[PDB]
Amino acid sequence: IRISERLRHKGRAVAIFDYERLVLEKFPQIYKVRCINHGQFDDAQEQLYELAPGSVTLAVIPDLSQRSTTNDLEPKVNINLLQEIEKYLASVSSPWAMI
Amino acid sequence: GLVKTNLTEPLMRMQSFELGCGNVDEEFYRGFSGVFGLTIDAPLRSDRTPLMGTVKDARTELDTVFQVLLQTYRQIIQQAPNYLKASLSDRQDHQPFLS
Amino acid sequence: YQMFATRNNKATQETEIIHDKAQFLQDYPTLSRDRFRAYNYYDCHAVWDTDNVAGFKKRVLRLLGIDDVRRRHLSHYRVDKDSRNLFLSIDFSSDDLTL
Amino acid sequence: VTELDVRKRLIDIPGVRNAWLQKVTSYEPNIYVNFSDKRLQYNPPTAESKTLNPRGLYTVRLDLDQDYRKNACGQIDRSWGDTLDEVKQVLCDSRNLCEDFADIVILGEEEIGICADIQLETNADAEDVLVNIYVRIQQFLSPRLKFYTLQELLDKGKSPAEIFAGRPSVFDGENRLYKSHGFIDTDELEALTLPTILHTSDLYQEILQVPGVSAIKKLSIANYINGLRQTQGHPWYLQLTDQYRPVLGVKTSKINFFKSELPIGVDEEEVERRYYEQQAAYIKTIRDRDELDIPVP
Amino acid sequence: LPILVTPEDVNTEPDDPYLLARTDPYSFWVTIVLPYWPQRFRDIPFRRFVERTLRLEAPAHIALKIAWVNVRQMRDFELAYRHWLEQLALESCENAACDLTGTLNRLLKILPQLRNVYPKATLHDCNNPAILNQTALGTAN
Amino acid sequence: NLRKRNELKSLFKNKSRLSETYFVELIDSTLNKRDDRFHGIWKPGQTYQKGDVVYYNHSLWEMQSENEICAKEEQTPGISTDWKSLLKELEQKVDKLQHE
Amino acid sequence: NLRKRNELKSLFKNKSRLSETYFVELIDSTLNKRDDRFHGIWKPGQTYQKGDVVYYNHSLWEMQSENEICAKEEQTPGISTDWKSLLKELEQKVDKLQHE
Amino acid sequence: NLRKRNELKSLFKNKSRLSETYFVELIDSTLNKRDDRFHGIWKPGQTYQKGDVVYYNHSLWEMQSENEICAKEEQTPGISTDWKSLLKELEQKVDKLQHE
């Protein structure tokens, strides 16, 4: 599975398929992910802008199949892991993309 | 490798110096360039220097050629000692009268 | 997808699918490798009626089933101005038997 | 696709020693937005306005080697026009969607002059010590990258997926597409950047490593451009000019030598000749298929 | 190019993702022009599936503009587009272009004018019924 | 016309300040290919005006047309009827006498 | 002669610090109409020296007189006996042969 | 080709800061004797390339040899077989016709 996916995205992130598969392989604790094209997120307002050329946004869900938490119907991901994924993706993509 | 990176222009300058004084050793340059695979074209006459200029200009030119030649010479001499034991332990078909 | 009623025998459809798959498999590595590359505007001999186009065009046109990827004219309709208004006829005015 | 992937391609062009990219953040001509007339214009509508810089443009900074070839009439000169043409032809053949290149800039160089008072050991010779100082400082300031063969990188334990990550294909069938000198190590590419501030302690700790040097009584540095001193100097740090690479100014440095409160003479011109002679050599050549690809058994 | 702003925008931030998209029409924008008359391109359900495919393949951070045009505007675009490409190449290929700016200015006047073609509306009751979101209005006379 | 290389080189030294008279003397003393009508070797992609002089193969040519023209790739001095030269008229005339 | 436009354009940038050298290369690399003896098109009001070359109608002319002259309005190359040209001597000679 | 002396003189004024566009326009608008192939009068001690044009006595000469050469004090256009000219071929041909 890993090598057949690499033979297609070449280890670089330029398209919806590339962002999604590069995350699911490196971080096994994610269950599902979605790549949003040309979209930006505003932290202060908690608003997403649907048209913003030059930005990319991702939304992720934790696994939770072998551990229990305080809200299993609307779970969250830890803040340190959200930053760890942004750094990895910034190193294998264009310099002009904001993630 | 070293010779292919470094020793073309010194050869051209030496050959021009020799043509200036009225005699060229074509066999030497042909042999050297054929052995190492270089390209030394037909030269011009440097009858301008260094027997026709300030004794400093006459000094600088000669030192400038000598420095490059000696750099490459020293690099080879310095790197040689690191291969002696491998030149022995890498075969089982040495001549018996030497082994 | 077959938009219109297909009169091809099932054997012909399967043969066409095999043909298309073999061609796609032979082409793939260069369709994938340059998926993010733009056209070269430095090449002053390859402006029109050429394949000097972006990889995006090549991939998308292959996925939709169009087999000609070039900068060609796509408009073949023109409007002219015709000033010829003179017209010959011969007649026996009896019931307009005319040529 | 990324910055290092372009640096590795530029460094593989004959005549280029290193390269850097920079984003364009100020675009000329300036463009202003007129809200009253709802249009873009060259003029500042309010004289207090912002310039609407468009995004997607790069600035290429080149470091060229100096060939100094001998002319037909007997002199020495340097010509780089063909290198600029080749760099442009290469770059315009590899740009991505929605990106362009604004300009290409050639970097200059600064000379760093060093003034110092060194105490020597009894069993020492100032001449060789000074030669070693010049060699070590020059190696410190201007490192060069090494090109590898595929096999000698595989012998370091790197999987092919990490070696071929960003390279464009060299061969298509039996046709060579471009000429290549080998592979560059990413870990070493990421460590070569342009500094802005020099710190004297980085020279203090390396001068203290030469055999025969006992203690450093005085050390300071100064900036030279075009042979003229630009400033007065500073004991602890120096700021560099944006467009220039630091090198060692051997002709403008002065290091005094004292053994137990007694001065010792040094033949400086012979030191300079010895410094030129002891420079290390390097290999940069064109390689064939056997050293570039991996055939089917 | 046009920018589509109003005076009330002078009191907001220039970095607003919605405002910045309107005042900066030069960054990560791409235009695709297609003819409408071919018989597979006259089918609106097919027309919409083709648009979706183009958006999946394009890079993540790039936005597209897609227009389906008639015969009059397809020729007006192709002639101006061709002449600008030839002049752009000559400046790069040894500074040999003539009238580069004039060729550009004649292209910036056609891009804002491209529009999609839809069939005319006719009311349905109990031969081509009007369907909401995919029909155009006529004129009084 | 006024100054030589060794006189112009005397105004641009290492510690001096610039001034407008230096550039006036620099501009007047070199050859202005627009104002003195001489463009060197013919190149396609240029624009020329009435009276320009250009060197093409083994001849100097003056442009006759009074309106500006764009130097087209496949219009070259000798093919078109914009340019003119005497070394070709006289050449053909002497060839004729030689043949006669 | 030493540098091209693309090499000279490489020394003058906003973020570059200039010097005496750049101007030496600028002056040596362009055409000095005084030192290389070529003035383009004839104009009245100039002063010329022995050896100057000037283009007047369909011919290049070299000045013969050894002392400086002022280009007078009603003295023009062909009328006066200062200038000279071969495309006129040869022209007249071939005209003579043609007539004979 | 783009600008005149009176337009270039307008960028260097009593209170005008420098910029790179001024020098771009200065370099493009004057004659670059390397890139446009024209060197004026022949001089001893200069190196030439294929295609150069040079004025020697009453004639313009183009270099034929494809490799760089050096102006030898003895080798002068007309003596050597590097250079070429038409005003000499035609001259000799018309002289022949005149004699015949």
mmCIF file of C-alpha atoms in Angstrom, chain D residues 3-210:
data_model
loop_
_atom_site.group_PDB
_atom_site.id
_atom_site.type_symbol
_atom_site.label_atom_id
_atom_site.label_comp_id
_atom_site.label_asym_id
_atom_site.label_seq_id
_atom_site.Cartn_x
_atom_site.Cartn_y
_atom_site.Cartn_z
ATOM 1 C CA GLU D 3 13.158 25.404 -2.643
ATOM 2 C CA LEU D 4 15.895 22.819 -2.115
ATOM 3 C CA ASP D 5 14.689 20.953 -5.202
ATOM 4 C CA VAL D 6 15.529 24.066 -7.218
ATOM 5 C CA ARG D 7 18.828 24.805 -5.482
ATOM 6 C CA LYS D 8 20.042 21.288 -6.305
ATOM 7 C CA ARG D 9 19.162 21.798 -9.973
ATOM 8 C CA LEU D 10 20.864 25.187 -10.221
ATOM 9 C CA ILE D 11 24.069 23.979 -8.538
ATOM 10 C CA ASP D 12 24.385 21.325 -11.276
ATOM 11 C CA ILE D 13 24.987 23.892 -14.055
ATOM 12 C CA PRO D 14 28.627 24.428 -15.121
ATOM 13 C CA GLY D 15 29.896 27.668 -13.614
ATOM 14 C CA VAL D 16 27.439 27.893 -10.702
ATOM 15 C CA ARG D 17 28.939 27.254 -7.267
ATOM 16 C CA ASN D 18 25.865 27.875 -5.088
ATOM 17 C CA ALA D 19 22.401 29.421 -5.275
ATOM 18 C CA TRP D 20 19.582 30.798 -3.132
ATOM 19 C CA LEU D 21 15.950 31.769 -3.679
ATOM 20 C CA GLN D 22 14.075 34.709 -2.182
ATOM 21 C CA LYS D 23 10.446 35.799 -2.397
ATOM 22 C CA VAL D 24 9.501 39.157 -3.900
ATOM 23 C CA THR D 25 7.687 41.270 -1.304
ATOM 24 C CA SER D 26 7.795 44.695 -3.013
ATOM 25 C CA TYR D 27 6.728 44.954 -6.650
ATOM 26 C CA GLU D 28 7.737 47.773 -8.993
ATOM 27 C CA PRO D 29 5.857 49.546 -10.612
ATOM 28 C CA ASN D 30 3.658 50.300 -7.604
ATOM 29 C CA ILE D 31 -0.085 49.619 -7.885
ATOM 30 C CA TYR D 32 -2.721 51.432 -5.825
ATOM 31 C CA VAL D 33 -6.446 50.814 -5.327
ATOM 32 C CA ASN D 34 -8.864 53.721 -5.862
ATOM 33 C CA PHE D 35 -12.027 52.967 -3.889
ATOM 34 C CA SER D 36 -13.870 56.079 -5.077
ATOM 35 C CA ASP D 37 -13.477 55.204 -8.772
ATOM 36 C CA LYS D 38 -13.241 51.437 -8.135
ATOM 37 C CA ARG D 39 -10.071 50.888 -10.141
ATOM 38 C CA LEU D 40 -6.355 50.168 -10.018
ATOM 39 C CA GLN D 41 -3.922 52.947 -10.850
ATOM 40 C CA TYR D 42 -0.243 53.858 -10.710
ATOM 41 C CA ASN D 43 -0.742 57.001 -8.577
ATOM 42 C CA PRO D 44 -1.374 57.196 -4.829
ATOM 43 C CA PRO D 45 -4.985 58.377 -4.525
ATOM 44 C CA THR D 46 -4.565 59.584 -0.930
ATOM 45 C CA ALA D 47 -0.752 59.865 -0.544
ATOM 46 C CA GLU D 48 -1.271 57.421 2.365
ATOM 47 C CA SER D 49 -1.809 54.062 0.688
ATOM 48 C CA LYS D 50 -0.513 50.521 0.271
ATOM 49 C CA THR D 51 0.989 49.055 -2.852
ATOM 50 C CA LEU D 52 -0.979 45.799 -3.428
ATOM 51 C CA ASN D 53 2.002 43.515 -3.951
ATOM 52 C CA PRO D 54 1.048 40.472 -6.067
ATOM 53 C CA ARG D 55 2.265 37.062 -4.968
ATOM 54 C CA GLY D 56 4.044 34.206 -6.701
ATOM 55 C CA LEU D 57 7.389 35.683 -7.824
ATOM 56 C CA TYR D 58 10.948 34.633 -6.931
ATOM 57 C CA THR D 59 14.355 36.317 -6.906
ATOM 58 C CA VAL D 60 17.341 34.136 -7.823
ATOM 59 C CA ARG D 61 20.718 34.808 -6.180
ATOM 60 C CA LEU D 62 23.723 33.218 -7.896
ATOM 61 C CA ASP D 63 27.292 32.552 -6.795
ATOM 62 C CA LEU D 64 29.588 32.189 -9.801
ATOM 63 C CA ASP D 65 33.082 30.743 -9.971
ATOM 64 C CA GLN D 66 35.768 32.973 -11.492
ATOM 65 C CA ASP D 67 37.458 31.239 -14.420
ATOM 66 C CA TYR D 68 39.955 33.923 -15.523
ATOM 67 C CA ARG D 69 40.761 32.339 -18.890
ATOM 68 C CA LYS D 70 43.632 33.528 -21.073
ATOM 69 C CA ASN D 71 42.712 35.603 -24.132
ATOM 70 C CA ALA D 72 44.014 35.353 -27.700
ATOM 71 C CA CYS D 73 46.145 38.488 -27.469
ATOM 72 C CA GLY D 74 47.797 37.393 -24.244
ATOM 73 C CA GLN D 75 45.680 38.693 -21.359
ATOM 74 C CA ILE D 76 43.397 37.251 -18.644
ATOM 75 C CA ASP D 77 39.673 37.995 -18.504
ATOM 76 C CA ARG D 78 36.338 36.624 -17.293
ATOM 77 C CA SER D 79 33.009 36.280 -19.122
ATOM 78 C CA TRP D 80 29.731 35.071 -17.608
ATOM 79 C CA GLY D 81 27.089 35.927 -20.227
ATOM 80 C CA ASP D 82 26.711 32.324 -21.366
ATOM 81 C CA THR D 83 26.133 31.148 -17.796
ATOM 82 C CA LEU D 84 23.312 33.669 -17.380
ATOM 83 C CA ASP D 85 21.775 32.513 -20.656
ATOM 84 C CA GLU D 86 21.948 28.863 -19.612
ATOM 85 C CA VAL D 87 20.479 29.586 -16.178
ATOM 86 C CA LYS D 88 17.589 31.457 -17.782
ATOM 87 C CA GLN D 89 16.943 28.709 -20.334
ATOM 88 C CA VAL D 90 16.963 26.091 -17.561
ATOM 89 C CA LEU D 91 14.709 28.002 -15.172
ATOM 90 C CA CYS D 92 12.113 28.908 -17.791
ATOM 91 C CA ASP D 93 11.784 25.177 -18.586
ATOM 92 C CA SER D 94 10.974 24.119 -15.017
ATOM 93 C CA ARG D 95 8.512 26.662 -13.586
ATOM 94 C CA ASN D 96 5.245 25.470 -12.050
ATOM 95 C CA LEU D 97 1.686 26.716 -12.517
ATOM 96 C CA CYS D 98 1.032 30.302 -11.435
ATOM 97 C CA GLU D 99 4.671 31.125 -10.670
ATOM 98 C CA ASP D 100 7.229 33.240 -12.496
ATOM 99 C CA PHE D 101 10.734 34.622 -11.984
ATOM 100 C CA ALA D 102 11.212 38.349 -11.500
ATOM 101 C CA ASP D 103 14.984 38.692 -11.950
ATOM 102 C CA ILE D 104 18.408 37.068 -11.602
ATOM 103 C CA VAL D 105 21.067 38.685 -9.410
ATOM 104 C CA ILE D 106 24.806 37.970 -9.169
ATOM 105 C CA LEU D 107 26.235 38.147 -5.657
ATOM 106 C CA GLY D 108 29.429 39.988 -4.812
ATOM 107 C CA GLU D 109 31.967 39.346 -2.091
ATOM 108 C CA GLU D 110 33.342 41.068 1.003
ATOM 109 C CA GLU D 111 36.819 40.639 2.441
ATOM 110 C CA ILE D 112 37.159 40.150 6.198
ATOM 111 C CA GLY D 113 40.326 41.697 7.603
ATOM 112 C CA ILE D 114 41.564 40.314 10.911
ATOM 113 C CA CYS D 115 43.795 42.073 13.444
ATOM 114 C CA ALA D 116 45.183 39.911 16.219
ATOM 115 C CA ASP D 117 47.918 39.510 18.821
ATOM 116 C CA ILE D 118 48.774 35.846 19.463
ATOM 117 C CA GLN D 119 51.041 34.266 22.070
ATOM 118 C CA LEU D 120 53.060 31.306 20.775
ATOM 119 C CA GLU D 121 54.579 28.307 22.503
ATOM 120 C CA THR D 122 58.350 27.955 22.773
ATOM 121 C CA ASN D 123 58.463 25.098 20.245
ATOM 122 C CA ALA D 124 56.686 26.926 17.443
ATOM 123 C CA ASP D 125 57.292 28.567 14.063
ATOM 124 C CA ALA D 126 55.137 31.606 13.313
ATOM 125 C CA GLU D 127 55.188 31.063 9.536
ATOM 126 C CA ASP D 128 53.473 27.672 9.403
ATOM 127 C CA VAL D 129 51.118 28.672 12.217
ATOM 128 C CA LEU D 130 49.973 31.709 10.227
ATOM 129 C CA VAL D 131 49.574 29.548 7.114
ATOM 130 C CA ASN D 132 47.368 27.177 9.112
ATOM 131 C CA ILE D 133 45.339 30.103 10.457
ATOM 132 C CA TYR D 134 44.654 31.455 6.977
ATOM 133 C CA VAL D 135 43.722 28.003 5.674
ATOM 134 C CA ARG D 136 41.372 27.210 8.560
ATOM 135 C CA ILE D 137 39.618 30.588 8.462
ATOM 136 C CA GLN D 138 39.140 30.436 4.693
ATOM 137 C CA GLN D 139 37.697 26.934 5.011
ATOM 138 C CA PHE D 140 35.406 28.235 7.760
ATOM 139 C CA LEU D 141 34.005 31.117 5.717
ATOM 140 C CA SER D 142 33.375 29.505 2.298
ATOM 141 C CA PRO D 143 32.581 25.776 2.356
ATOM 142 C CA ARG D 144 31.924 23.867 -0.866
ATOM 143 C CA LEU D 145 29.589 20.934 -1.507
ATOM 144 C CA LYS D 146 30.681 17.465 -2.622
ATOM 145 C CA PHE D 147 29.047 15.442 -5.407
ATOM 146 C CA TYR D 148 28.497 11.723 -4.807
ATOM 147 C CA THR D 149 28.034 8.587 -6.853
ATOM 148 C CA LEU D 150 24.794 6.680 -6.254
ATOM 149 C CA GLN D 151 26.665 3.676 -4.865
ATOM 150 C CA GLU D 152 28.599 5.643 -2.260
ATOM 151 C CA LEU D 153 25.345 7.155 -1.002
ATOM 152 C CA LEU D 154 23.699 3.723 -0.839
ATOM 153 C CA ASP D 155 26.705 2.665 1.239
ATOM 154 C CA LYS D 156 25.679 5.320 3.795
ATOM 155 C CA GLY D 157 22.260 3.724 4.311
ATOM 156 C CA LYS D 158 19.985 6.095 2.375
ATOM 157 C CA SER D 159 17.035 4.501 0.597
ATOM 158 C CA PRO D 160 16.655 5.405 -3.104
ATOM 159 C CA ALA D 161 13.337 7.129 -2.335
ATOM 160 C CA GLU D 162 15.288 9.747 -0.352
ATOM 161 C CA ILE D 163 17.946 10.160 -3.059
ATOM 162 C CA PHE D 164 15.674 10.612 -6.083
ATOM 163 C CA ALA D 165 13.077 12.671 -4.185
ATOM 164 C CA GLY D 166 13.364 15.906 -6.176
ATOM 165 C CA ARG D 167 15.474 15.140 -9.217
ATOM 166 C CA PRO D 168 14.148 15.503 -12.749
ATOM 167 C CA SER D 169 14.677 12.500 -14.990
ATOM 168 C CA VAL D 170 18.079 12.378 -16.677
ATOM 169 C CA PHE D 171 17.386 9.790 -19.396
ATOM 170 C CA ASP D 172 14.383 9.057 -21.606
ATOM 171 C CA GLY D 173 14.942 5.744 -23.330
ATOM 172 C CA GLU D 174 18.473 5.928 -24.700
ATOM 173 C CA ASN D 175 18.382 9.732 -25.025
ATOM 174 C CA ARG D 176 20.197 11.844 -22.446
ATOM 175 C CA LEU D 177 18.101 14.860 -21.476
ATOM 176 C CA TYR D 178 20.764 16.773 -19.534
ATOM 177 C CA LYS D 179 24.273 16.257 -18.204
ATOM 178 C CA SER D 180 24.760 15.566 -14.515
ATOM 179 C CA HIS D 181 27.695 15.561 -12.108
ATOM 180 C CA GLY D 182 26.194 13.306 -9.419
ATOM 181 C CA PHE D 183 24.145 13.556 -6.238
ATOM 182 C CA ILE D 184 24.171 16.147 -3.446
ATOM 183 C CA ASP D 185 23.464 15.283 0.192
ATOM 184 C CA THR D 186 20.365 17.101 1.473
ATOM 185 C CA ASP D 187 21.690 17.278 5.038
ATOM 186 C CA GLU D 188 24.702 19.261 3.837
ATOM 187 C CA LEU D 189 22.678 21.433 1.469
ATOM 188 C CA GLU D 190 20.475 22.612 4.339
ATOM 189 C CA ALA D 191 23.530 23.677 6.373
ATOM 190 C CA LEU D 192 24.947 26.176 3.825
ATOM 191 C CA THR D 193 23.179 29.534 4.151
ATOM 192 C CA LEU D 194 24.141 33.189 3.884
ATOM 193 C CA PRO D 195 25.007 34.642 7.301
ATOM 194 C CA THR D 196 24.240 38.225 8.254
ATOM 195 C CA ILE D 197 26.195 38.619 11.515
ATOM 196 C CA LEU D 198 29.711 37.334 12.142
ATOM 197 C CA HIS D 199 30.748 36.565 15.719
ATOM 198 C CA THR D 200 34.394 36.745 16.737
ATOM 199 C CA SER D 201 34.153 33.799 19.139
ATOM 200 C CA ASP D 202 33.697 31.487 16.143
ATOM 201 C CA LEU D 203 37.173 32.550 15.004
ATOM 202 C CA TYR D 204 38.583 32.591 18.568
ATOM 203 C CA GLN D 205 37.672 28.918 19.107
ATOM 204 C CA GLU D 206 39.263 27.847 15.802
ATOM 205 C CA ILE D 207 42.459 29.871 16.150
ATOM 206 C CA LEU D 208 42.827 28.213 19.553
ATOM 207 C CA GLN D 209 42.959 24.813 17.796
ATOM 208 C CA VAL D 210 46.256 25.293 15.913
#
